[PDB]
Amino acid sequence: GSHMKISARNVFKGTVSALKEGAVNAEVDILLGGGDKLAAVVTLESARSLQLAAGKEVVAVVKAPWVLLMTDSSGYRLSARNILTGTVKTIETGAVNAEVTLALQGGTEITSMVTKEAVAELGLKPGASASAVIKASNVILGVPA
Amino acid sequence: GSHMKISARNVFKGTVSALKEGAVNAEVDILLGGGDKLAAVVTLESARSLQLAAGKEVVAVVKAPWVLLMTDSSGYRLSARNILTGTVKTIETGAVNAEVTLALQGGTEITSMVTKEAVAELGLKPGASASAVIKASNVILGVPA
Amino acid sequence: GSHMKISARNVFKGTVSALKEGAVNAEVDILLGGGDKLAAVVTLESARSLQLAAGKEVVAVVKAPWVLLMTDSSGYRLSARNILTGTVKTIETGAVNAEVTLALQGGTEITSMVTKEAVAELGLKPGASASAVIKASNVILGVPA
Numbered sequence: 106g107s108h109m110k111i112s113a114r115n116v117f118k119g120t121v122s123a124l125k126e127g128a129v130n131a132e133v134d135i136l137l138g139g140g141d142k143l144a145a146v147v148t149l150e151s152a153r154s155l156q157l158a159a160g161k162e163v164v165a166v167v168k169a170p171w172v173l174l175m176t177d178s179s180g181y182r183l184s185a186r187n188i189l190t191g192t193v194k195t196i197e198t199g200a201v202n203a204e205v206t207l208a209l210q211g212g213t214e215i216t217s218m219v220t221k222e223a224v225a226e227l228g229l230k231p232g233a234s235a236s237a238v239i240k241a242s243n244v245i246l247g248v249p250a
Numbered sequence: 251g252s253h254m255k256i257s258a259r260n261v262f263k264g265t266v267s268a269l270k271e272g273a274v275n276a277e278v279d280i281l282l283g284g285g286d287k288l289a290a291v292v293t294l295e296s297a298r299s300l301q302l303a304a305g306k307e308v309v310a311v312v313k314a315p316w317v318l319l320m321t322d323s324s325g326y327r328l329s330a331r332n333i334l335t336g337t338v339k340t341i342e343t344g345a346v347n348a349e350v351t352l353a354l355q356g357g358t359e360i361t362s363m364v365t366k367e368a369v370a371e372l373g374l375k376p377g378a379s380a381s382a383v384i385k386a387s388n389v390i391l392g393v394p395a
Numbered sequence: 396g397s398h399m400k401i402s403a404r405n406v407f408k409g410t411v412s413a414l415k416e417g418a419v420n421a422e423v424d425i426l427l428g429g430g431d432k433l434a435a436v437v438t439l440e441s442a443r444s445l446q447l448a449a450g451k452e453v454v455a456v457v458k459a460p461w462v463l464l465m466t467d468s469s470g471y472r473l474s475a476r477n478i479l480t481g482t483v484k485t486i487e488t489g490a491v492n493a494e495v496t497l498a499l500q501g502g503t504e505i506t507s508m509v510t511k512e513a514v515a516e517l518g519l520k521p522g523a524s525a526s527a528v529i530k531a532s533n534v535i536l537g538v539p540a
């Protein structure tokens with residue numbers, strides 16, 4: 106095909122900047138288009154089978170409902186590895202849910218599915234600041250064949 | 251800020267009652283407000299960096315779509331660590347999805363996003379009994395700075 | 396009860412064809428009804444407590460929003476363990492989301508919740524080919540008591 110056609114709202118192309126393998130799992134640090142950084146955690150088995158290595162090109166795939174949005178950390182530090190700061194670009198409201206797209210510094214867009222109550226409570230609006238919070242274990246990797 | 255403002259429908263404050271670290275991951279057992287217990291699984295790296303320890307205060311964050319609802323286990327035992335029993339308090343139906351809030355014994359409320367077909371099939375209604383089923387690996391932790 | 400009543404759209408009965416335990420986690424390979432294969436990853440603790448073994452009957456539970464749909468891999472290989480190919484049987488559109496059901500070869504049906512934009516972009520329609528992509532870590536297991 107011309108590309109990979111997958112339902113996930115967020116499919117990023119990038120280059121591995123680091124590969125950190127343990128005996129069970131491996132942490133893959135990816136440098137995205139705009140300069141944004143995204144970490145993924147995959148099994149050791151996958152790191153070997155996909156032939157991962159620093160410097161190789163990969164795709165990182167994150168479904169919309171897996172992305173949490175945060176506006177005020179209030180000093181808290183979280184266990185999720187990926188905290189990407191950006192500005193709200195688009196909100197489309199559904200019945201219970203809504204789709205929010207943030208623009209990150211560098212130009213990458215990330216899409217989150219949250220409740221319409223969350224949009225309301227967070228005060229989201231075009232231009233508002235917010236961070237996308239993604240567990241590295243919720244990032245699926247792809248490698249070209 | 252006055253608090254942490256995050257999209258997740260479920261943000262619980264609690265105290266760590268146990269910390270169980272292995273070489274890869276760590277199990278964090280949290281005692282919530284009402285007496286409810288919730289287990290989270292985080293990387294070893296996070297357990298060290300966040301300075302986790304039994305007796306310390308934490309926040310546990312669970313997105314709505316990550317909570318499954320069960321009414322009849324029919325004798326089955328599941329691999330998910332958190333099975334919290336409660337009574338239905340609120341259901342708001344959307345187009346395909348719905349938001350269900352359960353009250354747990356002690357007073358904590360938990361919110362789940364499920365399909366409207368699931369609500370129908372389960373026979374959910376105010377006062378019905380049901381359990382929230384949450385994998386401990388789907389619980390994100392926060393620690394005050 | 397007559398069965399297990401749980402919200403997840405996908406609850407499959409099967410027999411364990413392989414059990415692969417490591418020091419942290421265990422991979423459980425399940426042979427489903429129609430001949431379809433599904434892999435689950437659970438803690439070692441659960442594999443021991445549930446008394447898992449090859450040849451035993453289990454239930455595998457996957458929430459709808461945890462299933463990604465793919466139509467053209469374009470040569471890419473992914474880190475998710477489960478790539479199940481099938482044909483679209485039913486789509487019900489909501490406001491922002493939609494529910495897609497695929498029929499797999501053998502007769503098993505799998506349901507995915509994706510955005511209505513994904514349905515549009517993928518060109519989904521009754522009879523179209525598509526694969527369900529599920530991380531083995533997003534499969535919850537149940538064992539009869």
Ligand code: MOO
Binds near residue numbers: 113168169
């Ligand atoms: O696969 Mo989706 O359309 O990001 O939920």
Ligand code: MOO
Binds near residue numbers: 221256258260314
């Ligand atoms: O971040 Mo949510 O999906 O409003 O619980």
Ligand code: MOO
Binds near residue numbers: 364366402405460
């Ligand atoms: O628990 Mo679900 O989101 O109705 O598959």
